[PDB]
Design a protein around this nucleic acid. Structure first.
Ligand SMILES: [Cl-]
Ligand SMILES: [Mg+2]
Ligand SMILES: [Mg+2]
Ligand SMILES: [Mg+2]
Length: 591
DNA sequence: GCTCTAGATTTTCATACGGC
DNA sequence: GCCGTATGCCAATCTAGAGC
């Protein structure tokens, strides 16, 4: 395939040079590069240009699913002729199996699956074999266990007009790859028959079923079919039907796997019983033998993922197969918000290991359950072909592995990194209150950041006493109601929002002209250099953007952020001067 | 170095049950 | 043994500080 970028506009401002640097580094074979793109500079359009120029299948990794969704929307509009795909957790809810020693409690695994997300997951994986012009937006789900891509590929049922194959032989192979017959409710992951037509709804597709028409053992035709109404659509010459699960469990391997699980259990029970952990072994035997009977009286068992490694016959310690393995060897990775996303990726292994080791220590699971896991960060490193880290505040790992940075600060809209004032703590709430009132005069909103949920709630109350319209925003408030609070800020219900750590990455509020950082000098994660610069960027979407940092000293963290903001402004002033640009505030749609 | 602390996101091969 | 349906808010992750 071949990527076709589609937009009205050309690259502008800093975008051209940025695109050129990243493309040349990629072509020279450089492994790690870093796009130091300041906020609201059109970072998704820049990276799309790179993808379009180098024409490699690409994985965009995001640290959260809201941002994941936006990237996926924007990229769908930029590449409407290409396979833009989505790959995140497909669980409506999920609690893992866990044991909590401090409160001596076992917690059952509970789950519930979202059908749309599973459909997208299958569209994503199948796309990577059907064609080369694929971009997948993904969460850290990308580093979790799937079945091997080789097995996933060889189980495909490939069909072409002219083929000779027994009607029932197709059907019986479809069942092998996890499809169900269903003449009543014809939906994805199911098939049916209507005389000569064998109608197949692939696992990757919402509304568009295949219709394979037979004459004896021949295939006279194949047809994509709109299943909203029932009408027929275009007539293909071939089609590929991929498995309706990323996990194969065939009996041929399962028989030996059972005796391997059987013999790991013996050894572990002897181990536990020897150490006077008699309760633990009784636990381990009761679950393992029950699961093993289910494994003999059925294909499945409960918690089957715990026996991943045995059921695959792969050795102890094995690195799992993942989405990354489904990509070609010359693929490309974009890491969105790398300073937050990479630490998250690092820690997926740690938390999973922690949780599973206590299950194993208390005899809920065998030691081989540790091999059912995500990648370690080191295993992620070894699977990188080439990678681009995007962030306004790139972290240590990105800088240390990249040959300097591609800097992109000039915004196509000419908006400046705001000015910053530093004021004393003496009489700070009154100074702020008056400064908010001037903003309410100009119909401009304000963000205030404190250190705690308690302080954010107390200031909201106190600002209500002063007659200011205001809400607090922190993580006690569920996602749905946060969307609504932010919506209601823009419409004008509130002139102020008080927060802690939800007022940085991916918050475009054009109406905000003031950002108030309280306790600006209290050293810690909330007032580190990066979180400081990220908070400052909330005021860079409005032409009268301003920052007040209340503090009595100026920390090292404060002085780097002040200096790097000033420098960025000065460069943006000069570009604006050269081109006669007067900064204009962002007109963005509500909802 | 170990053990707290604050406010943050993400992830994880559904399953027990009653009525057939 | 098969199948349709009601069901949960239950962990350990991160950074970068503070006491020892
Ligand atoms: Cl979506
Ligand atoms: Mg499934
Ligand atoms: Mg491997
Ligand atoms: Mg590679």
């Amino acid at each position: 395939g071949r990527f076709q970028l589609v937009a009205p506009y050309e690259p502008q401002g800093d975008q051209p040079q940025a695109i050129a640097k990243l493309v040349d580094g990629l072509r020279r074979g450089v492994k790690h590069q870093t796009l130091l793109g300041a906020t609201g500079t059109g970072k998704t359009f820049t990276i799309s240009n790179v993808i379009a120029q180098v024409n490699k299948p690409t994985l965009v990794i995001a640290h959260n699913k809201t941002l994941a969704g936006q990237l996926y929307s924007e990229l769908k509009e930029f590449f409407p002729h290409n396979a833009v795909e989505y790959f995140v957790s497909y669980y409506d809810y999920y609690q893992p199996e866990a044991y909590v020693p401090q409160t001596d409690t076992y917690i059952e695994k509970d789950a519930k699956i979202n059908d749309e997300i599973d459909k997208l997951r299958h569209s994503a994986t199948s796309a990577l074999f059907e064609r080369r012009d694929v971009i997948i937006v993904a969460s850290v789900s990308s580093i979790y266990g799937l079945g091997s891509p080789e097995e996933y590929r060889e189980l495909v049922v490939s069909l072409r007009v002219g083929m000779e194959i027994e009607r029932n032989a197709l059907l019986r192979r479809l069942v092998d790859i996890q499809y169900d017959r269903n003449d009543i409710d014809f939906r994805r992951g199911t098939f049916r028959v209507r005389g000569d037509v064998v109608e197949i709804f692939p696992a990757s597709r919402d509304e568009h079923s295949i219709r394979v028409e037979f004459f004896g053992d021949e295939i006279e035709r194949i047809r994509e079919v709109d299943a909203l109404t029932g009408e027929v659509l275009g007539e293909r010459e071939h089609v590929a039907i991929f498995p309706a699960s990323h996990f194969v469990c065939r009996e041929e391997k399962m028989r030996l796997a059972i005796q391997n699980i059987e013999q790991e259990l013996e050894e572990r029970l002897a181990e536990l019983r020897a150490q006077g952990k008699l309760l633990e072994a009784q636990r381990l035997e009761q679950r393992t033998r029950y699961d093993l009977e289910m494994m003999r009286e059925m294909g499945f068992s409960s918690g089957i993922e715990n026996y991943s490694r045995h059921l695959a016959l792969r050795p102890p310690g094995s690195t799992p197969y993942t989405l990354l393995d489904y990509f070609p060897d010359d693929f490309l990775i974009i890491v969105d918000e790398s300073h937050v996303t990479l630490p998250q990726l690092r820690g997926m292994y740690n938390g999973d290991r922690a949780r599973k080791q206590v299950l194993v220590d208390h005899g809920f699971r065998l030691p081989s359950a540790l091999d059912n896991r995500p990648l370690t960060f080191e295993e992620f490193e070894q699977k990188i072909n080439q990678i681009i880290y995007v962030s306004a505040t790139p972290g240590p790992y990105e800088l240390e592995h990249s040959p300097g940075v591609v800097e992109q600060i000039i915004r196509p809209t000419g908006l400046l990194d705001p000015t910053i004032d530093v004021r004393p703590t003496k009489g700070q709430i009154d100074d702020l209150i008056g400064e908010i009132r001037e903003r309410v005069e100009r119909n401009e909103r304000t963000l205030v950041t404190t250190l705690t949920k308690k302080m954010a709630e107390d200031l909201t109350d106190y600002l209500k006493e002063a007659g200011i319209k205001v809400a607090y925003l922190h993580s006690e408030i569920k996602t749905l109601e946060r969307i609504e609070i932010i919506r209601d800020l823009r419409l004008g219900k509130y002139d102020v929002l008080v927060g802690i750590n939800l007022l940085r990455e991916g918050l475009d509020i054009p109406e905000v002209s003031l950002v108030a950082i309280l306790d600006a000098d209290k050293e810690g994660f909330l007032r580190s250099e990066r979180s400081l610069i990220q908070t400052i960027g909330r005021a860079a979407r409005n032409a009268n953007g301003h920052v007040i940092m209340y503090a009595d000293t100026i920390t090292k963290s404060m002085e780097i952020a002040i200096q790097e903001t000033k420098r960025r402004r000065a460069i943006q002033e000069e570009y604006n001067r050269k081109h006669g640009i007067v900064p204009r505030t962002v007109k963005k749609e509500i909802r």
